[PDB]
Structure formats: structure tokens, C-alpha cells
Amino acid sequence: AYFQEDVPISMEEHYRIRHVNIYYYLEDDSMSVIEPVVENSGIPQGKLIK
Amino acid sequence: TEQIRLNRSAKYNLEKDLRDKFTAITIDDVCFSLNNNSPNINFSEKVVRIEP
Amino acid sequence: LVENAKNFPKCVLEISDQEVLEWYTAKDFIVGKPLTILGRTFFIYDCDP
Amino acid sequence: LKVAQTRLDERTRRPNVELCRDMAQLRLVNEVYEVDETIQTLQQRLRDS
Amino acid sequence: TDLPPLSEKSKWNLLRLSPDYKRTYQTFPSGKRVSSQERQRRDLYFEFR
Amino acid sequence: HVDLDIYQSSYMVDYKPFGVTPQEQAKLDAQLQSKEFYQPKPNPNPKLEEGYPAFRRPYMTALDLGVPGFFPPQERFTTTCHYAYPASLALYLAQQDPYWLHQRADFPCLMEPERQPAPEVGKGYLLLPGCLCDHHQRVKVPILNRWGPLMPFYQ
Amino acid sequence: SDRSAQHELEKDLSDKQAALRIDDKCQHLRNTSEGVSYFRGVERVDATV
Amino acid sequence: ACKTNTLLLDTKCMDTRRKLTVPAEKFVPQVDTFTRTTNR
Amino acid sequence: LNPSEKIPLDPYTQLRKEPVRKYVTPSDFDQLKQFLTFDKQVLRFYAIWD
Numbered sequence A: 001a002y003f004q005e006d007v008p009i010s011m012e013e014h015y016r017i018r019h020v021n022i023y024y025y026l027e028d029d030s031m032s033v034i035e036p037v038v039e040n041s042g043i044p045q046g047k048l049i050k
Numbered sequence B: 001t002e003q004i005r006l007n008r009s010a011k012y013n014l015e016k017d018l019r020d021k022f023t024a025i026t027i028d029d030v031c032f033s034l035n036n037n038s039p040n041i042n043f044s045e046k047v048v049r050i051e052p
Numbered sequence C: 001l002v003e004n005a006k007n008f009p010k011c012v013l014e015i016s017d018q019e020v021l022e023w024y025t026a027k028d029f030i031v032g033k034p035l036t037i038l039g040r041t042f043f044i045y046d047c048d049p
Numbered sequence D: 001l002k003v004a005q006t007r008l009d010e011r012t013r014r015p016n017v018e019l020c021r022d023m024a025q026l027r028l029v030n031e032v033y034e035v036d037e038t039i040q041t042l043q044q045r046l047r048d049s
Numbered sequence E: 001t002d003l004p005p006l007s008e009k010s011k012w013n014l015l016r017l018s019p020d021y022k023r024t025y026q027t028f029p030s031g032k033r034v035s036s037q038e039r040q041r042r043d044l045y046f047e048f049r
Numbered sequence F: 001h002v003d004l005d006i007y008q009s010s011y012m013v014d015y016k017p018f019g020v021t022p023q024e025q026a027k028l029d030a031q032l033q034s035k036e037f038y039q040p041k042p043n044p045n046p047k048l049e050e051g052y053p054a055f056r057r058p059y060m061t062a063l064d065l066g067v068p069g070f071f072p073p074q075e076r077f078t079t080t081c082h083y084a085y086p087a088s089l090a091l092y093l094a095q096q097d098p099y100w101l102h103q104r105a106d107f108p109c110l111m112e113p114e115r116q117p118a119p120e121v122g123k124g125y126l127l128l129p130g131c132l133c134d135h136h137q138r139v140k141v142p143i144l145n146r147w148g149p150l151m152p153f154y155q
Numbered sequence G: 001s002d003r004s005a006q007h008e009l010e011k012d013l014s015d016k017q018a019a020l021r022i023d024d025k026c027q028h029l030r031n032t033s034e035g036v037s038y039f040r041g042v043e044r045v046d047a048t049v
Numbered sequence H: 001a002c003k004t005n006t007l008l009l010d011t012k013c014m015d016t017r018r019k020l021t022v023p024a025e026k027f028v029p030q031v032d033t034f035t036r037t038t039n040r
Numbered sequence I: 001l002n003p004s005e006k007i008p009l010d011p012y013t014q015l016r017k018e019p020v021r022k023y024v025t026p027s028d029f030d031q032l033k034q035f036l037t038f039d040k041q042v043l044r045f046y047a048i049w050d
Helices: B002-033 C003-007 D002-011 D023-048 E008-017 E036-040 F010-014 F022-036 F089-093 G002-027 H002-016 I011-016 I031-038
Strands: A002-005 A016-019 A021-025 A030-034 A047-049 C043-047 F101-103 F110-113 I045-048
Touching: B002 G002, D002 D023, D002 G002, D023 F089, E008 I011, F022 I031
Parallel strands: none
Antiparallel strands: A002 A016, A021 A030, A030 A047, C043 I045, F101 F110
């Protein structure tokens, strides 16, 4: 899935589209959300939600 | 909505079983149709596996 | 020629490949139909074996 | 419509000498045509409603 | 689901930066290979090394 | 035991009447038509040299990015039409399919079969039921429901 | 010669066997049977012999 | 009814054609249908 | 399962992509080949001017 963030105070863009993966663990009915690292994006990426 | 979901699951299992039944019937028809004077009649093959 | 022939100084520069769009060519010379060269309609009689 | 198209696809698989244009084949093609016309008529009446 | 469209700046830059976009031997408008000495002359056509 | 090219002077061996590869010949020739009959085409897509204002015709969002050759890809009897009693879909099919009845537009309920039982003798027709006649239309024409004797045993 | 005739008959029997199996499966299909889907185009595809 | 009449008549003619092949009228010898024929 | 959809791409990353440093070779129907293989061949067409 992808979610869109408005970005202010930037030269170029006024929106983002960050790519993220949602895992659903059947064993206990849990969920996790992880953002795979993009090469030169200045966002600190990784695991969005535990 | 939940009852509909349950019906979908039962239908899915039924279709799966129907597919295996059709394949088995086809194989049995081919086996029954064989005869001594038939093409593709061939000897055995040697392989030992023990697989349940 | 190119549509940009409007700003081409014909009074100085000769017509060249940088200004022509198409060339007269054997697709146009085919027997039985006329073809205009320099305002001469030049109907094609016939041709060689 | 689904079942008619499935029958036609399956009968396309017949072997070389058996790949025959039979009256059932003609009838199935016509049936697919008619089902499409029926769907179009129903959609027309829906828009009118 | 609501996304804003791209500007002309962005569209031109994406076309220039596309993985598939390619250039050629800098032909004439008519469609002829441009001479290497012509390209050597630093004028309307340049060199691409 | 003797050789015959001896009796050939240098004049002929020099002077005789005038008498690549075929694939090269076939390839080279298709490359001449590829020039001789070549015609340019508009190539309807904004290119880099035209500039920014040309890049406004195709509308795209960030959804469309990534497609190869980056641009958005470009662009019999019907039952909707009113029909009377003898005109229907089956009447449209009444000739192409293995039945070969063709309407006679003068007398709408008189169809003609292509496969007639005896073309040497005069033609025969089939009659559609119902229908309607005006001004008595005096044509006495063959109609045939089956082929056989005039007085059958099994009727 | 007898071998040649029998070979021809054997090919004919095998082909009719496969064709009969396909035709049986087509005849016994039903409206909500397993493995029924859309096959748009088969009403126009015609590669008979 | 007329189509049935032929099929009833024709079955008679097929049936009467079994007056041949009687074991005393002909001598069919034994036949080896169950075989693996060797002309391959 | 619902029908799938295509995921939008990040315009910033597309802008930050590096270009195609390559080139495409031309045809070889040069004037040399045309001269060497089509010498001594001319076409004569009779015509009238009214």
C-alpha cells in the first residue's frame, strides 16, 4: 500500500507518495507496517509501526 | 455478510473436490480403454521411493 | 520544404537539405498520372521495358 | 453467457480431423450473439427507467 | 486516491529522464545521415561523445 | 593426349563478349524501397525540442508514471431498432445458418429456400404464418411443407 | 499392407476417443459448474478443418 | 410413424441375415483376437 | 478478492533518476553504397507538356 503526505516548505513538490508494506500475522491476529528503504529519500525509514 | 462468507468457503472446498474427481475419472477412463494391441503400450520403469 | 521556410533568406542562402522536407522521387514518377515540375504539368506518356 | 463461451472454448480443443464445423458449433456462436443482444436490450430499458 | 497532476516542468523532465527514451545519429530533417565533418564544425549540429 | 586451349590467342582471352550474394541483393533491395518509397509521418507525440507549452495535451498524474514509452496510450441486426412481426433476429439468421430462407420484399411473408428440390422445374417457396394481404396480390406460387408424393399413405 | 491399414485405424480410434471425451464434458456442463469463466473472442475464432 | 416403419422393417432384414453364420452352414475357424500382433 | 490496481510512482524519485547515457546506430545506405550498387541504372519516362 501507499499513503500520501503533504509536504510544505519545499522547492519542488507539494506531496509525497511513500511505499509501505503491511504484514498480517495469523498466529495472534497482529499487524505490522514496514517501509522499505528508498535510496536517496531524506526520510528516516524502516518500521513505521511495531 | 458473514453468512455469505461461510457459503463462499464451503463452495470453494466443493469445487476443489470436484476437480480432483474429474481428473481421477479421466485417468480411469484412459486406463480402462487400454488393450494389448494398442499404441503407447510400454513396459515399466524402475524407481523406488517409499512415499506416503 | 520545412514549414520554417518562412524565415529562410532565399535572397541570400540557397535551398539545402537543412530546409527541404521532401525530395522528388520515383514514387511520384509513375505511369498514367501527371506530375507538376516548376509549373509544367508533364503528363507521363509511357516508359521503357 | 459464461457457460456458452466455456463450451465454445472447450470445443476448440478437438483434434485435427475432428476439428469440424458442426451445427452445434453454429448454434453456440448464434447463442452467444443472442445473449449479447439480450443484455443490450436490458441495459437500454434500465436507462429509460 | 486524490492525486494532483504533474506540471509541464515535471512532464518534460520525466520524458528526458525516462529509461526508454533514446537519441540517434542526428539526422537531417529530410532523413539523411549528417556528415561527420559537418558535426565537427561547431555549428547547428554538435558532437556527442 | 593433346590439349585444346593451345589454340586460343591472347586477343580473345583478353577480349570477349560481355555476358555480392543473392541475400545481399535481396537485403540491399528492400533498403532501396525503404528509401525510395519512404514517406514521413507526423509522429503525434510532443518531443523534447518543442518545449514546455507543447507538454500540456496528454493529461497525466503520478499514477501513470512508469509505463514504457512514457505517454498515456491513445484511443448485424440489432434489437434496439424497432422491428415488426416478420423481422427478428432469427430472420437475420434465417439465411447464413444451415437454413437458407431469404425474404421476398414484395410479399414479406414469402421466403425462398436456396436448396430447392428441383431447380430444373420452376421454383418453390415457403409461407410464413399470420401476415396480411392487400389488394388481393394475385400470384399463385408454390408453397411446400415437405417433399414426397401428393397423396401419402402415412398422413 | 495389413500393418499399414491397422495403423490408420488406430490413429482414427485415438482421435475419436479424445474428441468424444471433450464432447461429453461439454454436453454435461451446467450453469454453475466448476471452472466456468469468460472466454471473449471464441465466438469469432474459427480454425476448423 | 413412417420413419418407425422402416426401422422395424430394416431390423427384420438385419435379423434374417443371421440365417447365415449358423455353425452348420459355415465353418468359421478359431480366431486369435487376443494377441500382440508381430507385424509391428 | 477485489480487482487489483496499479501503484503510483514517486515523482521526486523519478526526477532524481539518472539518464540513459547511450545512443542508437544509423542505417548504412550511404551515398557510397547507392553509387556502388546502382550505377549505370537510369529510368526513362516519355512525357508530353501541353
